[PDB]
Write a protein that binds this DNA or RNA. Sequence first.
RNA 1: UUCAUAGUCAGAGGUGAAAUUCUUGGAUUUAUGAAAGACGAACAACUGCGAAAGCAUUUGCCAAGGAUGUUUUCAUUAAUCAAGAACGAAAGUUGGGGGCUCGAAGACGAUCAGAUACCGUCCUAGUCUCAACCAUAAACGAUGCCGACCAGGGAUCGGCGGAUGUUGCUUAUAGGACUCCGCCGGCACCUUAGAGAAAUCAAAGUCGGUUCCGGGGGGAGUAUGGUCGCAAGGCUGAAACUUAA
Lengths: 50, 121, 92, 49, 82, 112, 119, 102
Amino acid sequence: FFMDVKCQGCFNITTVFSHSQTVVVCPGCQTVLCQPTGGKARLTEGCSFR
Amino acid sequence: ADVEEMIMKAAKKGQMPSQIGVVLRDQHGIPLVKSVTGSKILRILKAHGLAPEIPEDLYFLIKKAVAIRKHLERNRKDKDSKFRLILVESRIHRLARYYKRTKKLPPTWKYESTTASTLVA
Amino acid sequence: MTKRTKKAGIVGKYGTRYGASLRKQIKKMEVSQHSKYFCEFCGKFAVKRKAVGIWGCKDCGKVKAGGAYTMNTASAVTVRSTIRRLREQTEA
Amino acid sequence: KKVIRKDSAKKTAKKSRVKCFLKLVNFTHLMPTRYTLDVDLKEVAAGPD
Amino acid sequence: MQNEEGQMVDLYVPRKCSATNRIITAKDHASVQINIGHVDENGLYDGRFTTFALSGFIRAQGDADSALDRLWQKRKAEVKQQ
Amino acid sequence: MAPTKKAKKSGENINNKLQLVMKSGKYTLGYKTVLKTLRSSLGKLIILANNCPPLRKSEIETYAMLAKISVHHFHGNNVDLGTACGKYYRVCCLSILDPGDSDIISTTTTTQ
Amino acid sequence: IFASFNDTFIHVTDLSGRETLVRITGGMKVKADRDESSPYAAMLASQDVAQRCKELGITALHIKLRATGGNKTKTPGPGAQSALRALARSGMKIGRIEDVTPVPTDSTRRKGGRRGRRL
Amino acid sequence: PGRGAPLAKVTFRHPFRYKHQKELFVAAEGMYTGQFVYCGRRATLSIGNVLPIRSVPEGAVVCNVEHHVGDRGVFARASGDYAIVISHNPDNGTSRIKLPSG
RNA sequence: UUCAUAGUCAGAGGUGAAAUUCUUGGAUUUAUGAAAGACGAACAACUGCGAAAGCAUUUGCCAAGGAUGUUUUCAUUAAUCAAGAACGAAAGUUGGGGGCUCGAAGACGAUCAGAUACCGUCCUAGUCUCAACCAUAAACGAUGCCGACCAGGGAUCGGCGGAUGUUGCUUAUAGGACUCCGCCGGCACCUUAGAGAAAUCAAAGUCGGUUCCGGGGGGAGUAUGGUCGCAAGGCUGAAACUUAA
């Protein structure tokens, strides 16, 4: 699916995929985003569907 | 339709070969390359792309098989009693025999390399 | 096989003369030594017999004690494993 | 590291690169085993074991 | 004494650490749910527990089943280590 | 499996991405040239695939120290590392340089 | 004072029953059985015997030395078992606690039907 | 030749004066050229090392066992045999060993 | 079980009934302590996992494989397959270590008409470990293996999409589980209607792929020759003849 997220810390907006396979790094610097994990990557950014 | 939906959210031509073509050249790894950028952009690679040149791919299945075989061969020189193990090693060697039926009819170099590669890296 | 029916290894050493219960064992127990063996140190198919219980690797030259007929065996293996386990429990 | 031994003969000198690697590696083993002992002792004297 | 130390060894803190490990270990089986025990360093049980589930909860159960009688018997144990 | 429990040897997935590096590798094969390459300081990782003798492991390790290497003691003289490297390889000492790739050295820069 | 202490054990085999009155120290004061009297055999396997034994012990155990408090401990099921305890009450001994504590079957795991002897 | 099984030639080099060192010690299974031998009380518990029974962990197969201390080793000698040290405990008094006859 | 130490008397062992056996030179039973060997009760369940055989102390290490979810790669790549090759319980066989409970054969007592039998005591290889053979089991799910479709119903395990708050942790909070539905793979039962000789199956269905293989019983999974095995034996595999089953 498509998901628009915004970094709380970066306060920047970015678009990442849901339940991604690898760690998602903020393009702004490189802070963590969603995490892959032990499955079902979820997250720690906020927004809605893009 | 499917593809058109992705085009409107992407970038598609010109930009994409440059974005893709760094990551391949540190060393190989095509499914990894699709899992970075830019997200939307790399999704529509497979729906509109040839793809570009690489060392490996065609080798990678054979390379990985030789790589497991050499450690498994150590644990088939220590104690025989690992009766489950002998047909793990035999399966990849012999899947390699199956793989080098199909990726041998389209091209040269593959015929020549793939006999020899078995046991030597 | 080559020109061998039953099988042999040694069995010509008997000939027709000699006899059967003992022949089931003795191919097996000289020939299992004869089997090129990979050295525990190097891995090349060097290991050959110096004497009874004495084995030596031709390439690296590492010479080892072992069974009379064989390079190894169950008993040696078991003894080493038990010792290692005991040291590991004490270290604990 | 010659033991040399002696000719005119059928002798066997012990082996030139190997008895320098056997001394240089004894020394390369003695210098980390002394440095680790010198570290282990620095750490044990400073705080723990 | 020392044999009683040497085999007892350490504290209330290691009982908890030991309880924590048996709870991680368990699951394997089916999934549910009851048993933990830690058998000591010489020969008593520190404690036995009623669990499902988790790392904090069973350090607690560990803290709890290590209440007075069992707590006191490691406190006797640990004093004997000296 | 879980952090504190059940089986795990996932560090061995080094071998899968090494084989995958080896595919187009810059590399070094055998002591005489390995010795040329480690003494040129180029290598970032070496694998030693045989239960290599005290003297003849420590010499490779001192070259690894002179260079900027990490030492993988594969050490089991079966050499299934030889599957990647060319399986005529009954004995194997191996250096890794630019494969045209390489998180692999980083992957195995943490132990397991 | 009644410190009142005298541990009693009930030892079960299907065939027969015997009592030993021990103490904390582990020496045995007395034991009593069948076959000190005449009936032997398939007269043994009785529960009647478990009674008689349960008493022959007690009468001594108690007048001379004088124990009163005693902890009852028994081992897995015999015919005699129930009857063994039941007389300990009429013993004029005050039964302190009752523990069954048998030896379970517990991984005495062999084919030689070791397992079966135990409940 | 005097028993038909192998010895391992060991050097042994330690000093003092008298110092004494040497030589051809009884082989165990698995002893090889270039393996380390340790002889004494805080020797590592590894095959081929010699040390008093007290230092040995229970349940470990041994050979060249002494009758009497410093006689140097009597029982378990011949080819493929071994004694088994069953009991110790910290046994100040006695170490119980089972010889190959049982 | 053995050893040692404590204490102690006239039995104990064993069964249908007994005897063998054990037994005053102090047993057994009893307490504590040591060593060795074996196995993992309780847990362990219509339960999970390996290709199968099989595999169960927790715990640490190397390394494999099947779930899923991804839509990445080959983009239908694939499937089954005589020959070939690998593994393949137990029991046997062989060298060497260990050898406790157990335990063929064997030694004996009872039974009894006989017992070399069940039942009892004793007992060795074996059981076990490392090395190395064998190639077989009621190797069974009595169901080859591949794929498609065709009924539901109770929940079991794994993950997955969660929904939903609460225990409960911890405490910014979240899952382990829990109220709670759905998917995917296996499981099994419960359990259908057209099939099956019926019993039953819900796959053994509705009819397609593919290999092996079958031949009335007995003679016979035997003869003979070839092949493998140290041997045991195995794979391979008939007829004369006999019978109205």
